[PDB]
DNA sequence: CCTAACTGACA
DNA sequence: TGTCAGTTAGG
């Protein structure tokens, strides 16, 4: 039967409302309503740039300058960079770098 | 280039 | 259980 695979439909529609109600710090409970997409699955879709709580402004200049600096000293510490960078959680700035800025300017 | 999607290791 | 560091997948 259908299980795992891409994350959408009865996936976002759940975490999307459950996060705005509880918050991204109860993945253990959030998971219970996602049927099989438990524990980590919910976190995977989220904590990146999905959070409707942060409009998809994306990288351009005022943010593209972050990786160029933040990574230059704390790149391998995406967790703290992300914390000091509201919006792009510990995943957006991580994959962005290793795809877009994969040249360590 | 851009976000999404997951795994292994760690706190 | 959640986070932390890196890699993978589709558009």
Please check whether strand C approaches the CB of A99 to within 7 Å. Answer: yes
Cβ-based contacts with strand B at under 7 Å: A 4-8, 40-41, 44-45, 48-50, 56, 58-60, 91-92, 94-96, 99-100
What's A57-105's CATH class? mainly alpha
b/e A64-86 (16+ beta carbons within 10 angstroms → b) = eebbeebbeeebeebeebbeebe
In angstroms, rounded to a whole number, what is the distance separating the alpha carbons of residues A97 and A68? 9
The ranges of chain A annotated as CATH 1.10.10.60 are: 1-56, 57-105
Q: Say if CB A12 and CB A45 are below 8 A apart.
A: yes
Determination technique for this PDB entry? NMR
Cα-Cα-Cα-Cα dihedral sign, residues A40, A44, A47, A52: negative
Closest CA to A101 of A74, A67, A63, A61: A67
Say which CATH topology domain A1-56 has: Arc Repressor Mutant, subunit A (1.10.10)
Nucleic acid strand B: bases within 7 A of protein CB: 1-7
User: Cα separations (Å) of A10 from A17, A35, A54?
Assistant: 11, 10, 21
Specify the 3-state DSSP secondary structure of A74: helix
């Amino acid at each position: 039967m259908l299980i795992k695979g891409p994350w959408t439909k009865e996936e976002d529609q759940r975490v999307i409302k459950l996060v705005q109600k509880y918050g991204p710090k109860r993945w253990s409970v959030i998971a219970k309503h996602l049927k099989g997409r438990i524990g980590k699955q919910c976190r995977e879709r989220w904590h990146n740039h999905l959070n409707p709580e942060v409009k998809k402004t994306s990288w351009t200049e005022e943010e593209d300058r972050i990786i160029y600096q933040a990574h230059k000293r704390l790149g391998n510490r995406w967790a703290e960079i992300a914390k000091l960078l509201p919006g792009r959680t510990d995943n957006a700035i991580k994959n962005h770098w290793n795809s877009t800025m994969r040249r360590k300017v």
